[PDB]
Design a protein around this ligand. Structure first.
Ligand code: T9H
Ligand code: HEM
Length: 442
């Protein structure tokens, strides 16, 4: 009962190169040419079955670890999160560790986040956008605000003195540049010559050492993310080692650094284009009554329109293209069976362009709704739904409201940028993100 297979021209590659040159065109072509939302491609040539029919999403996002296993596709993350941590730990321990982190990012921790985010955005604009007008790279400035604001929400004063946002961002960038995403499926790529020595193992040790000194200094005489993590207790009564705590801190910062940056950038590139003037007017009608000091209720409860803006930016250009699982027990999807040992995948990129669920999918329409229930999967669904999503939305909406209150923006090109599918987390093409800001005062 197998899904149809896309023909393979080069057995050793399968489709990894066709996918890589244009994942959107490739995946739409398969789904169109095989006349099936559910179809199988080759990635060197491991079978990957894509559930590209939004009616079948729950069949991918609902099964538990025993049936659909996430960990096999993250072997590359081991040197980053740390040996034996997270995806390299036994499953019950992994679930507990991700859950400790989820607990640090609930509503209940957010009471002082909105002013901390605002103070930091404002400091960034005063320092970097200080003429009446100027030309910036919006994607780079969003990245800087996202790291700065995250640090101010999650890290205590003492930790920020040993490790400012700029040094944090350099450490994460070192750990990131060592990764070969395609090594998930072709681990021999790890054997190819590097232009430069990898600094991942060293960036992490350096972070772990700073964290250890902060911890010793705190014991000599604390409710930030580090402190929350230090009070966590496994069900067997033991606690996290420093190795583990460091792994979780890395995962939390690493997860949001591109995804959140990209979401903010897209939302601003859309809002500022002149054809979207009606939407920018609507955003202003939402925010123009707010006090200068926003609070949690303003952002969580009184920005429904800004949130539709953020969601629609992820719908149109989801920063995570594909989510994957090892099939541990055969599963039904639609009228097919997907066999044990396949990789199964569901792609936000593909599903978010399904013509039935999202008519005119290349149009950014913040007022649209999904026409297939559950077809938006930008933050996942079910068992592995994103645990960072409320924090990421708070952050992005808070930056929108803060920047648009004091500045106007002009995109220096005819159209909202093209997505650049060549990076593992996908955002607007970098050299298309030049923007002129105009300070409203002066
Ligand atoms: O950015 C990625 N991951 C990173 C690191 C990461 C991994 N797992 C996590 C779990 C929790 C937190 C972080 C991570 C990441 O930040 N992911 C992430 C997940 C959830 N929320 C926010 C961010 C990422 C992005 C793409 C990707 N691939 C792997 C395989 N290929 S490929 O060429 O071999 C291919 C396979 C199938 C079609 S093409 C494509 C890119 C692999 C990746 F790990
Ligand atoms: C806009 C920002 C984000 C986007 C667009 C996004 C996207 C996603 C997606 C698509 C999934 C599903 C993964 C799957 O089904 O395999 C997911 C899960 C997850 N995300 Fe995010 N994410 C974002 C921000 C964050 C942040 C800030 C964090 C942590 C600080 C985070 C941590 C996680 C974790 C721990 C999981 C679940 C891992 C699992 O159960 O295997 N995300 N996210």
């Amino acid at each position: 009962t197998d899904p149809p297979v896309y023909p393979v021209t080069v057995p050793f590659l399968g489709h990894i190169v066709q996918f890589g040159k244009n994942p959107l065109e490739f995946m739409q072509r398969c789904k169109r040419d095989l006349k099936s939302g559910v179809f199988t491609i080759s990635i060197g040539g491991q079978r990957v079955t894509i559930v590209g029919d939004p009616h079948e999403h729950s069949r991918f996002f609902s099964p538990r670890n025993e049936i659909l296993s996430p960990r096999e596709v993250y072997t590359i993350m081991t040197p980053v999160f740390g040996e034996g941590v997270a995806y390299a730990a036994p499953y019950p321990r992994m679930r507990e560790q991700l859950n400790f982190l989820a607990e640090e990012l609930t509503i209940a921790k957010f009471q002082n986040f909105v002013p901390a985010i605002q103070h930091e955005v404002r400091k960034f604009m005063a320092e970097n956008w200080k003429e009446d007008e100027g030309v910036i790279n919006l994607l780079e400035d969003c990245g800087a605000m996202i790291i700065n604001t995250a640090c101010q929400c999650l890290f205590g004063e003492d930790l920020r003195k040993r490790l400012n946002a700029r040094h944090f961002a350099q450490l994460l960038s070192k750990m990131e540049s060592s990764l070969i995403p395609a090594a998930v499926f072709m681990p021999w790529l790890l054997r190819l010559p590097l232009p430069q020595s990898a600094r991942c193992r060293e960036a992490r040790a350096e972070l772990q050492k700073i964290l250890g000194e902060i911890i010793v200094a705190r014991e000599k005489e604390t409710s930030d993310l580090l402190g929350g993590l230090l009070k966590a207790v496994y069900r067997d009564g033991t606690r996290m080692s420093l190795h583990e705590v460091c792994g979780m801190i890395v995962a939390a910062m690493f997860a949001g650094q591109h995804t959140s940056t990209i979401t903010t950038s897209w939302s601003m590139l859309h809002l500022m284009h002149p054809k979207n003037k009606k939407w920018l007017d609507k955003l202003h009608k939402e925010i123009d009554e707010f006090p200068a000091q926003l609070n949690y209720d303003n952002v969580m409860d009184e920005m429904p329109f800004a949130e539709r803006c953020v969601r629609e930016s992820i719908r149109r250009d989801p920063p995570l293209l594909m989510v994957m699982r090892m099939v541990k027990a055969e599963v039904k999807v639609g009228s097919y069976v997907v066999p044990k040992g396949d990789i199964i995948a569901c792609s936000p990129l593909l599903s978010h362009h399904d013509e039935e669920a999202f008519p005119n999918p290349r149009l950014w329409d913040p007022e649209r709704d999904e026409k297939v229930d559950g077809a938006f999967i930008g933050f996942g669904a079910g068992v592995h739904k994103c645990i960072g999503q409320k924090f990421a939305l708070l952050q992005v909406k808070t930056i929108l409201a803060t920047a648009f209150r004091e500045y106007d923006f002009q995109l220096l090109r005819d159209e909202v940028p093209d997505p650049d599918y060549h990076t593992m987390v996908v955002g607007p093409t970098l050299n298309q993100c030049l923007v002129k800001y105009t300070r409203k005062k002066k």
